[PDB]
Amino acid sequence: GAMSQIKLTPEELRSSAQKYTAGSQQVTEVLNLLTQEQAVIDENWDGSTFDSFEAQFNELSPKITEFAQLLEDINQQLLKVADIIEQTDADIASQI
Amino acid sequence: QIKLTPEELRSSAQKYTAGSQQVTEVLNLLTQEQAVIDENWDGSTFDSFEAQFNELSPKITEFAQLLEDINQQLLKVADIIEQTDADIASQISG
């Protein structure tokens, strides 16, 4: 099962995990910033010249949030798996 | 009609192109991490996360490109307006 199938150590899992959570935060930050810029552009540019970009942004936006949530979810799972493996190593060590 | 000056337009554009780049950076970086996990975790347990990531990836690419396209248009419009503002100033003064 998992103990056999997983080759990464708890430390290696945590190292990967950190990249996912940093990535998730960066994606969220870009989305929030540019969602604000879209509004600014909408309010200081009367008309409909910008309507097509607005709509593309709006359609993709929820997908970007899903991505960010996925990356954070991967972080959480990796961390929990690392903990479980680490405790396992500890228990097996004691047993002998 | 356009309340934003060319300088304000370029300031906004810079945020779009930096966002584009940053989003793509995260995608590329974690695409390699996905491969690390795939290679070092045998079996199908991580298959769902792999599928979800692979499914969203193309949208992340579309979004990054949308961001850059917006940047490029903002720059073009800023240039147009810059020339316009100069032409009008020169008209009135001259």
- Domains, chain A, with CATH or none: 1-96 (1.10.287.1060)
- Distance, in Å, from the CA atom of A50 to the CA atom of B73, rounded to the nearest integer, reads 10
A48 φ/ψ angles, rounded to the nearest 5 degrees: -135, 15
- Distance between CA atoms of A63 and A67, rounded to whole angstroms? 6
- Helix or strand (DSSP H, E) at A3: helix A2-5
- What DSSP designation does A42 have? H
List beta partners, residue A6: B41
Contact criterion met (CB < 8 Å) for B41 and A70: no
Cβ contact B60–A63 (<8 Å): yes
Give A50 to chain B, closest Cα distance, Å. 10
CB-CB neighbors (< 8 A) of A71 in chain B: 26, 30
User: Is the Cα dihedral B17, B23, B26, B30 positive or negative?
Assistant: negative
Coil, strand or helix: which one is B86?
Answer: helix
Q: Are A57 and A38 in contact (CB under 8 A)?
A: yes
Identify the CA nearest to A13 among candidates A89, A86, A88. Answer: A86
Cα gap B47→A25, rounded to integer Å: 24
Packing angle of the helix pair A51-95, B6-40 (nearest 10 deg): 30
Nearest to A27 by CA among A75, A62, A70, A64: A64
Check CB contact under 8 Å for B40 and A7. yes
Chain B hits for A23, CB-CB cut-off 8 Å, are 26, 29-30
- Tracing tokens 């309010």 back to the chain, one arrives at A43
Q: Which residues of A touch B62 (CB under 8 A)?
A: 60
User: How far, CA to CA in Å, does A85 sit from each of A6, A33, A59, A96, B41?
Assistant: 9, 39, 41, 17, 13
Phi, psi dihedrals of residue B2, rounded to the nearest 5°: -105, 105
Tokens of A55: 């709509």
Q: Quick one: tokens of A74?
A: 């991967």
- Does an H or E element contain B4, and which? none
Query: Please, which experimental method was used?
Result: X-ray
In this structure, what are the phi and psi dihedrals at residue A6, rounded to the nearest 5 degrees? -85, 115
Q: Give the closest residue to A24 by CA, choosing from A64, A77, A80, A58.
A: A64
DSSP A48: S
